[PDB]
């Protein structure tokens, strides 16, 4: 047998209230766009911002 | 060098083939759309010596003459085409077949293979492809601005765009059926190609003259049964050990003779 | 999709499914180990000839 | 003394080398930043006898002549330079690598060695040293009255002093990368030295070029996978027994020769 690949279940998860004004939840499709110290472009669903 | 040695050297090889089939079946117990194998064996030569039914006297025949036989050979390993249990893994891109049909997929060299695996992905250009990156047929493109993909029981693929209350049809998925499903040649990666023993590829729509039904959000698991493979291992191991004991007995017999 | 302020998107891992998959994977792994052990007891028997 | 005996003797030696490699991999499970070894073999020379392709008649060539071969020889032992699992020890001095870089240390000989181990200590002089006491170039001195050490993801080392609201930078940890990582010569004590097959040491900061990042409070565990080693041990034991059986068969044939 051969492992064809490893996928990721991109379904919308739980939305949980936190009470902080700087957390954002993305319903449906969408990715937050980030840049690191090097300058590469990354994408993330975690809305815990500071 | 002696007859019993060759016969028990064929017995060993046949039992090793049986163990190979069992181990391959057990290794692929989790691959989706898998069909397990079964090895079949047949008798080798039968040396005539005294012919059975030979006319010994002018009125008396010899019943069941001295028919010394040779070992065993395997005809082939045949695929047990049965419906594997469907699993609800709740993704819009997983589709499972309910009948006896196959998906058609276009190989990079221009030829067409046939697969029953329903785990489909979307490439960068928007086409439906197999998880190995092979594009499905007769090509079902998916727009970038897609909100939901709906594949019905008839194979119709629909895409709902933003803010529009009506779905957009982007293609029609068809199933290929064969006269003989066993004769297909497996090329790996859950792909089968057509062979002359499998007749010709009959394309059909899912629900008509014999193609199966497609269920969205479902994956067809393998039909391998673990307990039966365990019991078959226990019996193949014993048979292999007993044939090896026959080899050893022949070896001991040849020792005394030479020593004489 | 739309942004909801003051809320976080939790993970989508269901624990029950993970546990049952762990059980079935353990059993499959044990079966493969068993056939590995059988192939040896066959090789050992052939060697002891 | 006979060709088959030499061939079997070479096979035994190769299997023993494989067993030593497996034992070395097993002994270094708990070592930090250890890369497992794998041995590669090659088949030895061939006694020619009849040349394959030699013109037998005026027009017909001889296909696949009598190429009787000798045993086997191990070419190389290659490391698997793959990112091992990171373990949280919550220590201010332990550093872990995320990419494919190496720490540069100074041996007391005067030459430079390279290590992936990150468990660092401070000596009585206040410098950063490896657990074997080797001083970690390009050299970080930690002051006496330190309250906490912060090593950033890019390698900046800062010390928070009492009464100072701002951290004080005391150095910059750098990573060396090689064009060929497997060519390094291991001298023991978790140290690799540069050879001519390991390219040239390219020094860079963690983040720039291709060097990996530094994680504080983490240690890189060895990449040794144990179950694979157990299966390899079973295979090695059986193959060694088979080669020993070949030696025994050759010995028996020689014994039956002598008496003649």
Curated annotation (Swiss-Prot), chain A:
Q: What is this protein called?
A: Flagellar hook protein FlgE
Q: Where are the transmembrane segments?
A: none
**Shown chain mapped onto the complete sequence:** 52 to 101 of 403
Q: What is the lineage of its organism?
A: Bacteria, Pseudomonadati, Pseudomonadota, Gammaproteobacteria, Enterobacterales
Q: Which family does it belong to?
A: Belongs to the flagella basal body rod proteins family.
Subcellular localization, as worded in the UniProt entry: Bacterial flagellum basal body
From Swiss-Prot, chains B, D:
PROSITE patterns to which the protein is assigned, alphabetical = FLAGELLA_BB_ROD
Per the record, its GO cellular-component terms are: bacterial-type flagellum; bacterial-type flagellum basal body, distal rod
Asked whether the UniProt record includes Transferase among its keywords, one would answer no
Question: SUPFAM superfamilies this protein is in?
Answer: Flagellar hook protein flgE
InterPro entries referenced in this protein's UniProt entry, alphabetically: Flag_bb_rod_N, Flagellar_basal_body_rod_CS, Flagellar_FlgE/F/G, Flg_bb/hook_C_dom, FlgE/F/G-like, FlgG_G_neg, LlgE_F_G-like_D1
- Gene Ontology BP terms: bacterial-type flagellum-dependent swarming motility
Subcellular compartments: Bacterial flagellum basal body
Q: Does the keyword Chloroplast apply?
A: no
**Which of UniProt's keywords are assigned here?**
Bacterial flagellum
Q: Which domain of life is it from?
A: Bacteria
Q: Name one Pfam family in it.
A: LlgE_F_G_D1
Q: How does it assemble?
A: The basal body constitutes a major portion of the flagellar organelle and consists of four rings (L,P,S, and M) mounted on a central rod. The rod consists of about 26 subunits of FlgG in the distal portion, and FlgB, FlgC and FlgF are thought to build up the proximal portion of the rod with about 6 subunits each.
Query: Per the similarity annotation, which family is this?
Result: Belongs to the flagella basal body rod proteins family.
Q: What is this protein called?
A: Flagellar basal-body rod protein FlgG
Query: Which organism is the protein's source?
Result: Salmonella typhimurium (strain LT2 / SGSC1412 / ATCC 700720)
């Amino acid at each position: 047998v051969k492992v064809a690949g490893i996928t990721q279940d991109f379904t919308d998860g739980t939305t949980t209230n936190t009470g902080r004004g700087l957390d954002v939840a993305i319903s449906q499709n969408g990715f937050f766009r980030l840049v690191d110290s090097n300058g590469s472009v990354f994408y993330s669903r975690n809305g815990q911002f500071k | 060098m002696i007859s019993s040695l060759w016969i028990a050297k064929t017995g060993l090889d046949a039992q090793q083939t049986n163990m190979d089939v069992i181990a391959n079946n057990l290794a692929n117990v989790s691959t989706n759309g898998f069909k397990r194998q079964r090895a079949v064996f047949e008798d080798l030569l039968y040396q005539t010596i005294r012919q059975p039914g030979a006319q010994s006297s002018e009125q008396t025949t010899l019943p069941s003459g001295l028919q010394i036989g040779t070992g065993v050979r395997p005809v082939a390993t045949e695929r047990l085409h049965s419906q594997g249990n469907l699993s609800q893994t709740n993704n819009s891109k997983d589709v499972a077949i309910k009948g006896q049909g196959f998906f058609q997929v276009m190989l990079p060299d221009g030829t067409s293979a046939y697969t029953r695996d329903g785990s489909f992905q979307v490439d960068q250009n928007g086409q439906l492809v197999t998880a190995g990156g092979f594009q499905v047929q007769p090509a079902i493109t998916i727009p970038a601005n897609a909100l939901s993909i709906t594949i019905g029981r008839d194979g119709v693929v629909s895409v709902t765009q933003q803010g529009q209350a009506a779905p957009v049809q982007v293609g029609q998925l068809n199933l290929t059926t064969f006269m003989n499903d066993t004769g297909l040649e497996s090329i790996g990666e859950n792909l089968y190609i057509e062979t002359q023993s499998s007749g010709a590829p009959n394309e059909s729509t899912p629900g008509l003259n014999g193609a199966g039904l497609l269920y969205q959000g479902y994956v067809e698991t393998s039909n391998v049964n673990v307990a039966e493979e365990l019991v078959n291992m226990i019996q193949v191991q014993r048979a292999y050990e007993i044939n090896s004991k026959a080899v050893s007995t022949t070896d001991q017999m040849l020792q005394k003779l030479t020593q004489l | 999709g739309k942004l909801t302020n003051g809320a976080l998107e939790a993970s989508n891992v269901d624990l029950s499914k993970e546990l049952v998959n762990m059980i079935v994977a353990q059993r499959n792994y044990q079966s493969n180990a068993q056939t590995i052990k059988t192939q040896d007891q066959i090789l050992n028997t052939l060697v002891n000839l």
